[PDB]
């Protein structure tokens, strides 16, 4: 215990940034930040991929921390779709983004500015997206996008609750994205430009990352599993879709699946984040989805202003 202190620290830190007492560094191309206020997952990766698709007319580089990765330095994970490292070296989320975005570069660094300077030197990108950037104040962003989910609104600061910062810090966002609307719909009004995000669960991937039809999940009970910030929303999605799940295994976030052995005759259903670690396993599939945003044309205008 407790708790009261973390908040002091975070508050102190934010005030220092608020008043020009800590350095904020600036990259010489536009930078969009995507981030959120809590631990446990908010659809940031998905929103990043959506953004990357909006931005397809530009050379895009994603700057990521690469959580849990086995490497140290600033690292180029992918150049314009050429994967330079294994998923274990990249961290599962940078690798997943690189893999699903064959037109985008991905760099992992603790210090995002440093990652960006390395990318500029080697990759020449026209825009950076920070994949988890909201708390990383020391890097200037031209558009600060905050993702919020319903749960956040009644949550509290770590380590009692899941908030990384108090809710008042919503003030720092240029735009809010209200996520997980297909599972926990909600409304937030703040006066800030606000966009609801929906995941449209439409697709099945085999372990070679090829689309396959659902006919396979028919009259089969599956064993489902994931290791996620929150496995609960995945198991809720499966129920809402009416997928017949006979057993659900809830693994730790970023689980490496070293212990995993499929049982003969069974069908396994999992997420793409998990499937990157199980490539080529037969009879392991992932549920995939499209990301859809309200008022996209409004969002696009907001996004393109940064280039002017
Ligand atoms: N309900 C679901 N169905 C299918 N895949 C899902 C899923 N929920 C999460 N995923 C997968 O896990 C990835 C992580 O998304 P998630 O919403 O869990 O956290 P995140 O993007 O906010 C990053 P972090 O957990 O590190 O904060 C997604 O891109 C997707 O591959």
Curated annotation (Swiss-Prot):
Enzyme Commission (EC) number: 2.7.1.130
GO cellular component term of the entry, any: plasma membrane
Keywords linked to the UniProt accession: ATP-binding, Kinase, Lipid A biosynthesis, Lipid biosynthesis, Lipid metabolism, Nucleotide-binding, Transferase
Pathway: Glycolipid biosynthesis; lipid IV(A) biosynthesis; lipid IV(A) from (3R)-3-hydroxytetradecanoyl-[acyl-carrier-protein] and UDP-N-acetyl-alpha-D-glucosamine: step 6/6
Pfam families reported in the protein's UniProt record: LpxK
UniProt KW Nucleotide-binding keyword: yes
InterPro entries referenced in this protein's UniProt entry, alphabetically: LpxK, P-loop_NTPase
Any one Gene Ontology BP term: lipopolysaccharide core region biosynthetic process
Catalytic function, reaction form: a lipid A disaccharide + ATP = a lipid IVA + ADP + H(+)
Binding site residues for ATP: 38-45
Keyword set includes ATP-binding: yes
SUPFAM superfamilies: P-loop containing nucleoside triphosphate hydrolases
GO molecular function: ATP binding; tetraacyldisaccharide 4'-kinase activity
Function: Transfers the gamma-phosphate of ATP to the 4'-position of a tetraacyldisaccharide 1-phosphate intermediate (termed DS-1-P) to form tetraacyldisaccharide 1,4'-bis-phosphate (lipid IVA).
HAMAP family named among the record's database cross-references: LpxK
Recorded family membership: Belongs to the LpxK family.
Official protein name in the record: Tetraacyldisaccharide 4'-kinase
Organism, as annotated: Aquifex aeolicus (strain VF5)
Gene it is expressed from: lpxK
């Amino acid at each position: 215990p407790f708790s009261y202190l973390y908040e002091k620290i975070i508050n102190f830190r934010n005030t220092l940034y608020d008043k020009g007492f800590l350095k904020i560094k600036k990259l010489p191309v536009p930078v969009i930040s995507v981030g959120n206020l809590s631990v446990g997952g908010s659809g940031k990766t998905s929103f990043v991929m959506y953004l990357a698709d909006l931005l397809k007319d530009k050379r895009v580089c994603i700057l990521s921390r690469g959580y849990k990765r086995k490497s140290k330095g600033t690292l180029i994970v992918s150049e314009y779709g050429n994967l330079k490292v294994s998923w274990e070296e990249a961290g599962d989320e940078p690798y997943l983004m690189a893999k699903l975005l064959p037109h985008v570069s991905v760099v992992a660094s603790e210090d995002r500015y440093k990652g960006g300077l390395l990318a500029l030197e080697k990759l020449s990108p026209e825009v950076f997206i920070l994949d988890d950037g909201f708390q990383h104040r020391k890097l200037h962003r031209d558009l600060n996008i905050l993702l919020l989910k319903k749960k956040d609104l009644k949550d509290r600061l770590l380590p009692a609750g899941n908030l990384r910062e108090p809710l008042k810090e919503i003030r720092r966002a240029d735009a809010l994205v209200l996520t997980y609307q297909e599972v926990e719909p909600f409304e937030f009004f703040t006066g800030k430009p606000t966009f609801k995000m929906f995941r449209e669960f439409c697709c099945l991937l085999n372990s070679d990352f090829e689309e396959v039809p659902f006919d396979i999940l028919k009259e089969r009970e599956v064993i489902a599993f994931s290791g996620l910030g929150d496995n609960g929303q995945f198991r809720k999605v499966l129920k809402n879709l009416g997928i017949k799940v006979k057993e659900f295994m809830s693994f730790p976030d970023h689980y490496d699946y070293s212990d995993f052995t499929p049982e003969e005759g069974e069908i396994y259903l999992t997420t793409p984040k998990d499937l990157i670690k199980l490539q080529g396993y037969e009879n392991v599939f992932a549920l995939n989805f499209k990301v859809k945003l309200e008022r996209e044309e409004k969002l696009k205008k907001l996004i393109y202003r940064i280039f002017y």
